[PDB]
């Protein structure tokens, strides 16, 4: 199995990518305070492990605050937006 | 806030370290198939995010299988042992 460390946005997001039978392709990582735009290929399932994300999804008007334990889904071939206050850890699965 | 990528055991364990108000000092990471010995400073709280760990704790005889969603605690200044099959992601908090 391959594990790889990834960095995005000048180091403000860092993750470990992997693949397993139970998750499919996935990442676990952390984001620090900031505002970020992400583009998906496959649809993505995001789980907030610790901290919180303000989430704007493409097909719905309102931002929503997702605290630790919450899960949201992003469609494929789409753009979504996040805002972060305290460092926030997450699991992302590429569905 | 600082985020740092860490590698252990010749790359078989990789993690992102961070610190936040809700977690204290913590890591999120992934381990691949293998058997690992860890030494603690502070006591540690481990959460299995995906996959599974076979866990041997210092003050109890039996190994126990911790699957996704489960949480265990390791005392400080101690050694514990893990066995991994499929890649397994985790959150570790330094208490």
mmCIF file of C-alpha atoms in Angstrom:
data_model
loop_
_atom_site.group_PDB
_atom_site.id
_atom_site.type_symbol
_atom_site.label_atom_id
_atom_site.label_comp_id
_atom_site.label_asym_id
_atom_site.label_seq_id
_atom_site.Cartn_x
_atom_site.Cartn_y
_atom_site.Cartn_z
ATOM 1 C CA UNK A 1 0.000 0.000 0.000
ATOM 2 C CA UNK A 2 1.108 3.516 -0.845
ATOM 3 C CA UNK A 3 0.998 6.400 1.645
ATOM 4 C CA UNK A 4 1.939 9.865 0.420
ATOM 5 C CA UNK A 5 2.130 13.241 2.138
ATOM 6 C CA UNK A 6 0.536 16.095 0.186
ATOM 7 C CA UNK A 7 0.603 19.866 0.675
ATOM 8 C CA UNK A 8 -1.758 22.468 -0.803
ATOM 9 C CA UNK A 9 -2.245 26.243 -0.644
ATOM 10 C CA UNK A 10 1.367 26.985 0.366
ATOM 11 C CA UNK A 11 1.198 24.500 3.211
ATOM 12 C CA UNK A 12 -2.086 25.659 4.771
ATOM 13 C CA UNK A 13 -3.615 22.238 3.991
ATOM 14 C CA UNK A 14 -1.601 19.043 4.450
ATOM 15 C CA UNK A 15 -2.809 15.460 4.118
ATOM 16 C CA UNK A 16 -1.822 11.804 3.853
ATOM 17 C CA UNK A 17 -3.283 10.019 0.827
ATOM 18 C CA UNK A 18 -4.003 6.279 0.828
ATOM 19 C CA UNK A 19 -6.351 3.626 -0.519
ATOM 20 C CA UNK A 20 -8.104 0.847 1.400
ATOM 21 C CA UNK A 21 -10.881 -1.670 0.860
ATOM 22 C CA UNK A 22 -13.206 0.010 3.360
ATOM 23 C CA UNK A 23 -12.648 3.619 2.201
ATOM 24 C CA UNK A 24 -11.619 3.446 -1.431
ATOM 25 C CA UNK A 25 -9.160 6.190 -2.296
ATOM 26 C CA UNK A 26 -9.016 8.693 0.551
ATOM 27 C CA UNK A 27 -7.040 11.378 2.385
ATOM 28 C CA UNK A 28 -6.765 12.378 6.024
ATOM 29 C CA UNK A 29 -5.457 15.826 6.721
ATOM 30 C CA UNK A 30 -5.576 19.176 8.465
ATOM 31 C CA UNK A 31 -6.413 22.731 7.390
ATOM 32 C CA UNK A 32 -5.470 25.938 9.191
ATOM 33 C CA UNK A 33 -7.352 29.232 9.391
ATOM 34 C CA UNK A 34 -8.260 30.514 5.954
ATOM 35 C CA UNK A 35 -10.693 30.375 3.058
ATOM 36 C CA UNK A 36 -10.229 27.735 0.367
ATOM 37 C CA UNK A 37 -11.717 26.793 -2.998
ATOM 38 C CA UNK A 38 -11.593 23.119 -3.996
ATOM 39 C CA UNK A 39 -12.420 21.403 -7.280
ATOM 40 C CA UNK A 40 -13.595 17.787 -7.336
ATOM 41 C CA UNK A 41 -13.119 15.029 -9.887
ATOM 42 C CA UNK A 42 -14.952 12.087 -8.333
ATOM 43 C CA UNK A 43 -17.679 13.065 -5.846
ATOM 44 C CA UNK A 44 -16.200 13.459 -2.372
ATOM 45 C CA UNK A 45 -17.402 12.556 1.114
ATOM 46 C CA UNK A 46 -15.914 14.747 3.847
ATOM 47 C CA UNK A 47 -15.940 13.905 7.556
ATOM 48 C CA UNK A 48 -14.926 16.530 10.107
ATOM 49 C CA UNK A 49 -12.669 14.717 12.589
ATOM 50 C CA UNK A 50 -11.842 17.687 14.820
ATOM 51 C CA UNK A 51 -12.506 21.409 14.556
ATOM 52 C CA UNK A 52 -15.109 22.846 12.189
ATOM 53 C CA UNK A 53 -15.673 23.865 8.573
ATOM 54 C CA UNK A 54 -17.994 26.460 7.093
ATOM 55 C CA UNK A 55 -19.102 24.785 3.857
ATOM 56 C CA UNK A 56 -20.570 26.215 0.652
ATOM 57 C CA UNK A 57 -21.782 23.568 -1.783
ATOM 58 C CA UNK A 58 -22.469 24.315 -5.446
ATOM 59 C CA UNK A 59 -26.186 23.450 -5.671
ATOM 60 C CA UNK A 60 -27.449 25.151 -2.488
ATOM 61 C CA UNK A 61 -27.470 28.799 -1.465
ATOM 62 C CA UNK A 62 -26.516 28.781 2.222
ATOM 63 C CA UNK A 63 -23.217 28.181 3.950
ATOM 64 C CA UNK A 64 -23.496 25.627 6.778
ATOM 65 C CA UNK A 65 -21.246 25.077 9.811
ATOM 66 C CA UNK A 66 -20.046 21.454 10.109
ATOM 67 C CA UNK A 67 -18.494 20.666 13.492
ATOM 68 C CA UNK A 68 -16.625 17.563 14.606
ATOM 69 C CA UNK A 69 -18.375 14.313 13.732
ATOM 70 C CA UNK A 70 -20.393 15.739 10.854
ATOM 71 C CA UNK A 71 -20.300 14.435 7.278
ATOM 72 C CA UNK A 72 -21.118 16.103 3.978
ATOM 73 C CA UNK A 73 -21.007 15.130 0.313
ATOM 74 C CA UNK A 74 -19.731 17.165 -2.644
ATOM 75 C CA UNK A 75 -20.788 16.271 -6.211
ATOM 76 C CA UNK A 76 -18.235 15.300 -8.800
ATOM 77 C CA UNK A 77 -16.729 17.723 -11.319
ATOM 78 C CA UNK A 78 -17.689 20.610 -9.067
ATOM 79 C CA UNK A 79 -16.249 23.476 -7.047
ATOM 80 C CA UNK A 80 -16.884 23.947 -3.323
ATOM 81 C CA UNK A 81 -15.676 26.456 -0.745
ATOM 82 C CA UNK A 82 -14.506 26.098 2.855
ATOM 83 C CA UNK A 83 -13.707 28.508 5.661
ATOM 84 C CA UNK A 84 -11.584 27.413 8.634
ATOM 85 C CA UNK A 85 -10.949 28.985 12.041
ATOM 86 C CA UNK A 86 -9.062 26.682 14.420
ATOM 87 C CA UNK A 87 -7.039 23.889 12.762
ATOM 88 C CA UNK A 88 -9.484 21.273 11.521
ATOM 89 C CA UNK A 89 -8.774 17.634 10.683
ATOM 90 C CA UNK A 90 -10.792 15.662 8.157
ATOM 91 C CA UNK A 91 -11.227 12.452 6.190
ATOM 92 C CA UNK A 92 -11.970 12.841 2.476
ATOM 93 C CA UNK A 93 -13.098 9.864 0.368
ATOM 94 C CA UNK A 94 -13.049 9.949 -3.454
ATOM 95 C CA UNK A 95 -16.245 8.108 -4.298
ATOM 96 C CA UNK B 1 -0.859 27.477 13.410
ATOM 97 C CA UNK B 2 1.795 24.957 12.456
ATOM 98 C CA UNK B 3 1.077 21.854 10.361
ATOM 99 C CA UNK B 4 3.900 19.385 9.787
ATOM 100 C CA UNK B 5 4.113 16.116 7.876
ATOM 101 C CA UNK B 6 5.853 13.301 9.758
ATOM 102 C CA UNK B 7 7.066 9.869 8.656
ATOM 103 C CA UNK B 8 7.941 6.873 10.845
ATOM 104 C CA UNK B 9 9.100 3.276 10.365
ATOM 105 C CA UNK B 10 10.609 3.890 6.905
ATOM 106 C CA UNK B 11 7.409 5.483 5.672
ATOM 107 C CA UNK B 12 4.959 2.807 6.854
ATOM 108 C CA UNK B 13 3.314 5.387 9.152
ATOM 109 C CA UNK B 14 2.761 8.969 7.994
ATOM 110 C CA UNK B 15 0.893 11.737 9.798
ATOM 111 C CA UNK B 16 0.131 15.454 9.956
ATOM 112 C CA UNK B 17 0.843 17.040 13.340
ATOM 113 C CA UNK B 18 -1.071 20.082 14.598
ATOM 114 C CA UNK B 19 -2.428 21.755 17.718
ATOM 115 C CA UNK B 20 -5.919 23.145 18.307
ATOM 116 C CA UNK B 21 -8.047 24.364 21.192
ATOM 117 C CA UNK B 22 -10.459 21.430 20.958
ATOM 118 C CA UNK B 23 -7.833 18.664 20.594
ATOM 119 C CA UNK B 24 -4.673 19.946 22.222
ATOM 120 C CA UNK B 25 -1.590 18.669 20.437
ATOM 121 C CA UNK B 26 -2.588 15.940 17.999
ATOM 122 C CA UNK B 27 -1.779 13.992 14.833
ATOM 123 C CA UNK B 28 -3.902 12.503 12.078
ATOM 124 C CA UNK B 29 -2.304 9.825 9.991
ATOM 125 C CA UNK B 30 -2.288 6.447 8.296
ATOM 126 C CA UNK B 31 -0.499 3.144 8.915
ATOM 127 C CA UNK B 32 -0.009 0.316 6.429
ATOM 128 C CA UNK B 33 0.170 -3.428 7.043
ATOM 129 C CA UNK B 34 2.734 -4.272 9.688
ATOM 130 C CA UNK B 35 3.497 -4.575 13.384
ATOM 131 C CA UNK B 36 4.654 -1.506 15.299
ATOM 132 C CA UNK B 37 5.945 -0.616 18.759
ATOM 133 C CA UNK B 38 5.249 2.907 20.030
ATOM 134 C CA UNK B 39 6.522 4.740 23.100
ATOM 135 C CA UNK B 40 4.455 7.498 24.707
ATOM 136 C CA UNK B 41 5.467 10.650 26.547
ATOM 137 C CA UNK B 42 2.133 12.224 27.463
ATOM 138 C CA UNK B 43 -0.772 9.756 27.671
ATOM 139 C CA UNK B 44 -2.372 9.330 24.254
ATOM 140 C CA UNK B 45 -5.955 8.966 23.058
ATOM 141 C CA UNK B 46 -6.273 7.084 19.764
ATOM 142 C CA UNK B 47 -9.361 7.102 17.545
ATOM 143 C CA UNK B 48 -9.623 4.676 14.634
ATOM 144 C CA UNK B 49 -10.972 6.729 11.718
ATOM 145 C CA UNK B 50 -10.957 3.983 9.085
ATOM 146 C CA UNK B 51 -9.605 0.442 9.019
ATOM 147 C CA UNK B 52 -8.680 -1.439 12.189
ATOM 148 C CA UNK B 53 -5.906 -1.873 14.748
ATOM 149 C CA UNK B 54 -5.012 -4.845 16.911
ATOM 150 C CA UNK B 55 -3.909 -3.171 20.149
ATOM 151 C CA UNK B 56 -1.758 -4.421 23.027
ATOM 152 C CA UNK B 57 -1.698 -2.078 26.013
ATOM 153 C CA UNK B 58 0.934 -2.311 28.746
ATOM 154 C CA UNK B 59 -1.260 -3.010 31.798
ATOM 155 C CA UNK B 60 -3.593 -5.663 30.335
ATOM 156 C CA UNK B 61 -2.871 -9.125 28.977
ATOM 157 C CA UNK B 62 -5.079 -9.439 25.889
ATOM 158 C CA UNK B 63 -4.815 -7.896 22.457
ATOM 159 C CA UNK B 64 -8.090 -6.283 21.329
ATOM 160 C CA UNK B 65 -9.332 -5.467 17.814
ATOM 161 C CA UNK B 66 -10.382 -1.803 17.444
ATOM 162 C CA UNK B 67 -12.356 -1.127 14.263
ATOM 163 C CA UNK B 68 -13.433 2.186 12.770
ATOM 164 C CA UNK B 69 -15.058 4.542 15.259
ATOM 165 C CA UNK B 70 -13.446 3.009 18.331
ATOM 166 C CA UNK B 71 -11.294 4.907 20.833
ATOM 167 C CA UNK B 72 -8.625 3.729 23.248
ATOM 168 C CA UNK B 73 -6.263 5.356 25.730
ATOM 169 C CA UNK B 74 -2.566 4.638 26.309
ATOM 170 C CA UNK B 75 -0.874 5.699 29.572
ATOM 171 C CA UNK B 76 2.015 8.111 29.557
ATOM 172 C CA UNK B 77 5.670 7.055 29.608
ATOM 173 C CA UNK B 78 4.670 3.648 28.293
ATOM 174 C CA UNK B 79 5.128 1.285 25.366
ATOM 175 C CA UNK B 80 2.235 -0.120 23.329
ATOM 176 C CA UNK B 81 2.011 -2.369 20.280
ATOM 177 C CA UNK B 82 -0.155 -2.274 17.157
ATOM 178 C CA UNK B 83 -0.808 -4.646 14.281
ATOM 179 C CA UNK B 84 -2.298 -3.383 11.005
ATOM 180 C CA UNK B 85 -3.824 -5.190 8.024
ATOM 181 C CA UNK B 86 -5.496 -2.831 5.542
ATOM 182 C CA UNK B 87 -4.321 0.809 5.671
ATOM 183 C CA UNK B 88 -5.794 2.388 8.785
ATOM 184 C CA UNK B 89 -6.277 6.087 9.515
ATOM 185 C CA UNK B 90 -6.309 7.516 13.022
ATOM 186 C CA UNK B 91 -6.404 10.586 15.242
ATOM 187 C CA UNK B 92 -3.910 10.660 18.119
ATOM 188 C CA UNK B 93 -4.180 13.267 20.895
ATOM 189 C CA UNK B 94 -1.304 13.957 23.318
ATOM 190 C CA UNK B 95 -3.158 14.461 26.578
#
